[PDB]
Amino acid sequence: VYRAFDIYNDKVAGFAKFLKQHEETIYNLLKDCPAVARQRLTKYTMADLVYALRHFDEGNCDTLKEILVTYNCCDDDYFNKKDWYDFVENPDILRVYANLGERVRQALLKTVQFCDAMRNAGIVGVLTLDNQDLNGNWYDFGDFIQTTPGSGVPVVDSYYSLLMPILTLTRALTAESHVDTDLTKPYIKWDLLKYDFTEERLKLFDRYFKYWDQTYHPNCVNCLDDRCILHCANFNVLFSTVFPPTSFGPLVRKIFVDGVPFVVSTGYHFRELGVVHNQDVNLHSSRLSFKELLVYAADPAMHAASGNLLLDKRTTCFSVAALTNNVAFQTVKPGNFNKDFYDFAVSKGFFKEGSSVELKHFFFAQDGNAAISDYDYYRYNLPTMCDIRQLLFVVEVVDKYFDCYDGGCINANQVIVNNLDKSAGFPFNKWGKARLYYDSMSYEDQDALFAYTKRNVIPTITQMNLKYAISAKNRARTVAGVSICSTMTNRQFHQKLLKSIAATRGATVVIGTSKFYGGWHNMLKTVYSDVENPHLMGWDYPKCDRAMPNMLRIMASLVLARKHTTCCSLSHRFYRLANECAQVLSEMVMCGGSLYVKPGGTSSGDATTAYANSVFNICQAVTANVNALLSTDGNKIADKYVRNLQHRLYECLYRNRDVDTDFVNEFYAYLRKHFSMMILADDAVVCFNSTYASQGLVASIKNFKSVLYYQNNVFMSEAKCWTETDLTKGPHEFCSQHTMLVKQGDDYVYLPYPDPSRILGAGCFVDDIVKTDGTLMIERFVSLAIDAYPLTKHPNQEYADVFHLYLQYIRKLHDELTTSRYWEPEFYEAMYTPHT
């Protein structure tokens, strides 16, 4: 009945579920190739396989279940296990998905043979997914126009691009690491000294994608623009799985300083950017300058080479070396107790049984294995090959969200450091802090180091450390400390654009907008805007920082650098992208005295983490809308304007090669009207036309579940997502705050109030012993009262008593201190008044 189809027609064009002698002459012309079989036709086609794996729904995954059993991927009783499809809970699903990768590979080879026969017979046509079998056999060659033999040109844009995410999900190219490309034969023992693999990359390209009508660059340093980088880097992630893992990373060259042999890094072999080479190398040198000596102490080339080999069975990641003679462990202290506050709280009618407010937030003690287990969570980071046609259209629409800011490069004297005395990273922390390096290396040295970064590559080590913070869950959390060498270059490159976003008001990205003085009301009014049938559908990202694909991280970094069209050349811009990948995406992480390899994901210490998170947040939200519009049947829409949008959206995706600046404007206007966003890093609140979503014209919660499955390798449950139908009460939760409508004079204004248990937990437990005496530090409880004041407006009487308890405890501290302003209940009323 309902089968997956890939249709382009007069008016209807989409990838949805539509219920279902010329060709005989064509059949004679194309009979020679073994690919052409309609006998031996599998109940399911390659379109059904790619449809189920792209639009995945719990309880409606019957098609995905029947295919897995039919092709002996697993037994039927595997499904009885609860949450089998969840990657995080059930990692064994990857082994089940990887068992039909060889069936995918045989389909790729049979496609080239079919294309070869169609070229030799002088035939022009377009390849679609629904014309194949799961075996790989081809049929459905009707709308093919004859021409002279030897000049036929296949069109393979729709077939290949849709099929791209399945190649890495099923691990189709695993057979290419075996001798003679046969699974039964042993592995290939590549030479340990090989790092080029350029010839095999072209052979891999020429065997699987022979007619991809675009020049492939094995090394991205030879690309033309940033849209070429995304195209060529996408193919590399599929070809980097074949080669041994020891080939990637920095490349070391022997150089001499004062006649003393030395080991430095003069290049880098990225899994995405191919192999690049530095341009300023000195075989023989002399007395080293500060900038040159600083670079020599930051690269992992000599740190790893002077250590000893390490074999760690705890972690499934890549171990490089062990700089220390033995592994080091560290534990976490439990939180301290404010007995005076607790005794006062229990006296004032609190903490009785049967009370709606209790104590739930604590500090949790951790053991030594917590640090390495949290690092081991990077096993959720998997090589993801994205749809490149979708990514090329989406990046333009996402970029239009960022066209109201001013960016560009700044000199070293236009840089603002928020907090100097934090850390300098590894190995710089052994000698000083970030203050030492800023005030020692001069203004001219800083610009030269930025200039040197535009013509070379700098790899760098970033340390990992633990966190001592309050939380309900006992999960450990780790924070990455980036080095001072990588921070200065990124500041001069991005601070102009980052400061502008934190200063712009009334935009989609709401970073830097305060919640005080009516800020909460203004942002909530902006997102409501002019939506016809408002509804709220905030969501959450499962395992955001560990499961981020590297393709979306590279795409986000290019958008942030789209503002350098004047100050930097294209050669200078590529060497900036190369630095970012070698210092954030994949790098050596010092996780407990031993060097490892970071497969990917975000780093806490990266300056642009929050802003790049917003770009990725918009990217998934934009992607979810285009998938919803294309998955909708084009013959059920009634609005003629949307149907033209739904038809031209397909054309701008697959049948085009240049940016269509006109349809991007229409699509951006369409989103701004019906899908209003409020974006702050991972958190997001959306006001959407409920009538459109019920018809399928905009993204829903289900559309986010499907996109997250194939573009993030994570499974989103219905627990952390929410939906509200009446705007009188605002978002169910945004940044861990609730909202309600209260009277203020003659005005109704939204107010943010936190969790009552969280506020009490902060007062009871402090992570420092010196904070026990509140007489010296009264300001801690004053700040908590400011956060907790809106609780007095709650209908629940037990909720309002938290502020009075906080307010009463403030008075009790003032008795020993001696003024009335802190105890004044109108001091906390001014912070939520529009007059600043």
Binding site: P245, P250, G267, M302, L309, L311, K313, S440
Partner: protein, 114 residues
């Protein structure tokens, strides 16, 4: 003066760490190069004269480093010292199924290149 002291602090580390490199392999492998370009990941895999193995449990220990000599990275390794998570020397007799619950995992195994 702040830039002067930090200059001497890190330039010595570049010179006092060249010496720490294993001289019996310094000439043996660091001197050897195919075309002056070699990946960095493989440098410790063949130049290091010392190996450290961290073992989570008994099942992994018997499957990887059973006996006094074990083969890994296409080379024979001779065990030198075994130390538990408490930083205490452990003799090879104690590692068995019977004494597995009494052991303080993880275990640190140190080898030496043949």
């Amino acid at each position: 003066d702040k830039r002067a002291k930090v200059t001497s602090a890190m330039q010595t580390m570049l010179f006092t760490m060249l010496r720490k490199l294993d001289n019996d392999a310094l000439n043996n492998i660091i001197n050897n190069a195919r075309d002056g370009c070699v990946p960095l990941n493989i440098i410790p895999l063949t130049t290091a004269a010392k190996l450290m193995v961290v073992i989570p449990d008994y099942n992994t220990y018997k499957n990887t480093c059973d006996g006094t000599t074990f083969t890994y990275a296409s080379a024979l390794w001779e065990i030198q010292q075994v130390v538990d998570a408490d930083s205490k020397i452990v003799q090879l007799s104690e590692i068995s199924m019977d004494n597995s619950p009494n052991l303080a995992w993880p275990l640190i195994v140190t080898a030496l290149r043949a």
